């Protein structure tokens, strides 16, 4: 327990700054775009569902892709190979048993070789300087869920859903830290289910006021409204499972009452 909850949260706050990607990176990518990055992340969410991977694995993979794309320019023909080695590395970090390399080749429809994927694994670690223990939205939400006043596993699911949705859209969501994304998602999911709001516990722990969250909340409210319409659907189709209380069936509030 809690002998470490405060230390860890503070330190997760330190680490998130050091594991920030460059925000304006996509505009310096010649061959690739926010929209192609959205294809890739959606696809990872499917791959994660196919091989029953944890949600952390997914967020970590997305963090690797962004930091790597911050320093390294990549042709479209090679983005998915970047994605696949990110997902391998994340699984190796986070999973108890990772799917074998072969399976990572298989899920691209045999377009890259095992040896390619392994050589890209190597190159991802070099550019990341073996720094793979990045804080995610998923990590922050889990700590936040400790401060839920009665616990409510529809709120929990619905926030997870929002946080995964932020993975998909680089602009706007790269401008926000994971700890803020998660503040937004938590409040949003809270609000939506019970009509309550981002609680004082967490205001004093995080030092975030509702109103400091406001901008991120506005961006995430829109995504939440627009989700049915988005080109990318894997996360919505993931969150209809009874596993997740089909929170993605639920009804977004049309106003936020700020």
């Amino acid at each position: 327990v809690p002998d470490y909850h405060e230390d860890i949260h503070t330190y997760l706050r330190e680490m998130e700054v050091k594991c920030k990607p460059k925000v304006g990176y996509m505009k310096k990518q010649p061959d690739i775009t926010n929209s192609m990055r959205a294809i890739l992340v959606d696809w990872l969410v499917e791959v994660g569902e196919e091989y029953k991977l944890q949600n952390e694995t997914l967020h970590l993979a997305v963090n690797y892709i962004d930091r790597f794309l911050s320093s390294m320019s990549v042709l479209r023909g090679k983005l998915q190979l970047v994605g696949t080695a990110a997902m391998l590395l994340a699984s190796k970090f986070e999973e108890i048993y990772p799917p074998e390399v072969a399976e990572f080749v298989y899920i691209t429809d045999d377009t890259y070789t095992k040896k390619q994927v392994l050589r890209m694994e190597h190159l991802v670690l070099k550019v990341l300087t073996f720094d793979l223990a990045a804080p995610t939205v998923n990590q922050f939400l889990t700590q936040y869920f400790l401060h839920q006043q009665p616990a409510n596993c529809k709120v929990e699911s619905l926030a997870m859903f929002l946080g995964e949705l932020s993975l998909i859209d680089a602009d706007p969501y790269l401008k926000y830290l994971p700890s803020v994304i998660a503040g937004a998602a938590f409040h949003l999911a809270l609000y939506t289910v019970t009509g309550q709001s981002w609680p004082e516990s967490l205001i004093r722990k995080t030092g975030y006021t509702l109103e400091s969250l406001k901008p991120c909340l506005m961006d995430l409210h829109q995504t939440y409204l627009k989700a049915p319409q988005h080109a990318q659907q894997s996360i919505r189709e993931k969150y209809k499972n009874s596993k997740y209380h089909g929170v993605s069936l639920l009804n977004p509030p049309e106003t936020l009452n700020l």
Binding site: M36, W43, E46, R76, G77, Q80, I107, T108, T111
Partner: peptide, 5 residues
């Protein structure tokens, strides 16, 4: 699934 090309 092969994406892009």
């Amino acid at each position: 699934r092969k994406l892009f090309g």
